[PDB]
Structure 1
Amino acid sequence: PNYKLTYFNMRGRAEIIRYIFAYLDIQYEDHRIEQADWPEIKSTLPFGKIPILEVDGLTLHQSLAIARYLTENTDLAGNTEMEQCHVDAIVDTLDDFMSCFPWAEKKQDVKEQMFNELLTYNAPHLMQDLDTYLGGREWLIGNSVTWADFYWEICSTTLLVFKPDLLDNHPRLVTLRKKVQAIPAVANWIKRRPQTKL
């Protein structure tokens, strides 16, 4: 069973796949491309977008669809059909925000303006809604860790790059961030992975 992950040299939307792998102890090759190799590959893929996962000469796309596939009947999945939902909902609420950023804007000031808006106007509200949804439970979904707990910590990672005082009023979020990061197989990948801004 053969794994070639394709994406740019960034955590980005691949990091949810790379946390899963290294958690669930599975060998993959981590194929990281140059911004200038991209069009040559972009042309050949059915949907022109990455990440993508090749699974013995089979081509998968859409990080979360993939993420959801590598966790169907595993302990990062929800212990029940309802908890699979909340997981997917939690993930999509975060992707919904993360997906808002003009990541690929080449006009810098125009980009910075848009990033700053969202990080002051929309961010704290998302953090709020999250903390409350967490309330006082140990994980986001049910009684153990799930990949939604991973998406969160990953999304939170990149947001923290751009606005450090973000979780100041949410220790229960810094707690959760940190409790996800201290997991053996997670903790170790965080130590080894390439060191990219994004």
Structure 2
Amino acid sequence: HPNYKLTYFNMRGRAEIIRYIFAYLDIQYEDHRIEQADWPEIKSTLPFGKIPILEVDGLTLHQSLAIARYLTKNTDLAGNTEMEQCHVDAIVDTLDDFMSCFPWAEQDVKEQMFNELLTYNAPHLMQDLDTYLGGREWLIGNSVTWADFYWEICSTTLLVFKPDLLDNHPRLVTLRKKVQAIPAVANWIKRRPQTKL
């Protein structure tokens, strides 16, 4: 059981998937939340200059989904078979692709691009996700995976900007609530720092 230090901004953002996994697996970690003012110094010490990073016994890992996958290796969150693991990885990247389209660090052009993505593109993605879910209980297989975690995390952020995101997708709302009801996840959701994003 190694020493884990997670470094990110004071927000859910790209660190939250790692935080859900730690909560579910009951893994102790330091939730290091930096202020924007401390970032220049920290940024200059990192191999690839981006966060989140996870220090594992002092060894710096980067890329939130690479880290998430590493932490879920040989756990019940990974997918029950090699093929299920592929399906999990694919859903995660499909979600991450969409979230990465938003110009988070871009006013005017930023506001325009956000409205276009939320209004013209998000509903299409929600439909494809609902279709993929196909009336089943979880996105992949017969039990929860970190793809379901990431679905709940990404949709929570999208709902902040688009409250009607899932008005045509009650089954996707049901999946969100199912993830949110998992005791370890429910406990983290009620206890985590309250931030907008």
Asked if Structure 1 and Structure 2 have the same fold, meaning a TM-score greater than 0.5 normalized by the shorter chain, the answer is yes
- In structure 2, the residue corresponding to 1:54 is in which secondary structure? strand
- In structure 2, the residue corresponding to 1:53 is in which secondary structure? strand
- How far apart are residue 36 of structure 1 and its match? 1.1
- How far apart are residue 104 of structure 1 and its match? 1.0
* Equivalent-residue separation in structure 2 for 1:77 and 1:110 (angstroms): 38
* Equivalent-residue separation in structure 2 for 1:45 and 1:130 (angstroms): 35
> In angstroms, what is the RMSD of aligned CA positions?
0.5
* Equivalent-residue separation in structure 2 for 1:166 and 1:136 (angstroms): 18
- In structure 2, the residue corresponding to 1:194 is in which secondary structure? coil
Q: Which runs of 5+ in 1 are unaligned?
A: none
- How far apart are residue 43 of structure 1 and its match? 0.8
* Equivalent-residue separation in structure 2 for 1:23 and 1:78 (angstroms): 15
* Equivalent-residue separation in structure 1 for 2:188 and 2:111 (angstroms): 30
1:3-44 superposed Cα distances (whole Å, 9 cap, x missing partner): 100000010000000000011101111000111111111111
| Segments of 4+ moved more than 4 angstroms | none
- How far apart are residue 109 of structure 1 and its match? 2.1
* Equivalent-residue separation in structure 1 for 2:137 and 2:177 (angstroms): 12
* Equivalent-residue separation in structure 2 for 1:162 and 1:120 (angstroms): 10
- How far apart are residue 110 of structure 1 and its match? 1.9
Structure 2 residue aligned with 1:10: 11
* Equivalent-residue separation in structure 1 for 2:20 and 2:112 (angstroms): 31
Structure 1 residue aligned with 2:114: 115
Alignment of 1:1-198 (within 5 A): 1-105=2-106, 108-198=107-197
- In structure 2, the residue corresponding to 1:37 is in which secondary structure? helix
* Equivalent-residue separation in structure 1 for 2:193 and 2:109 (angstroms): 29
- In structure 1, the residue corresponding to 2:58 is in which secondary structure? coil
- In structure 2, the residue corresponding to 1:36 is in which secondary structure? helix
* Equivalent-residue separation in structure 1 for 2:116 and 2:32 (angstroms): 33
1:112-161 superposed Cα distances (whole Å, 9 cap, x missing partner): 11111100111000000000000111000000000000000000000000
* Equivalent-residue separation in structure 1 for 2:49 and 2:102 (angstroms): 19
Q: Which runs of 5+ in 2 are unaligned?
A: none
- In structure 2, the residue corresponding to 1:77 is in which secondary structure? coil
Q: Determine which structure has the larger helix proportion and give its number.
A: 2
Task: Provide the TM-score with structure 2 as the length reference.
Answer: 0.99
User: Number of residue pairs matched?
Assistant: 196
Task: Provide the TM-score with structure 1 as the length reference.
Answer: 0.98
- In structure 2, the residue corresponding to 1:143 is in which secondary structure? coil
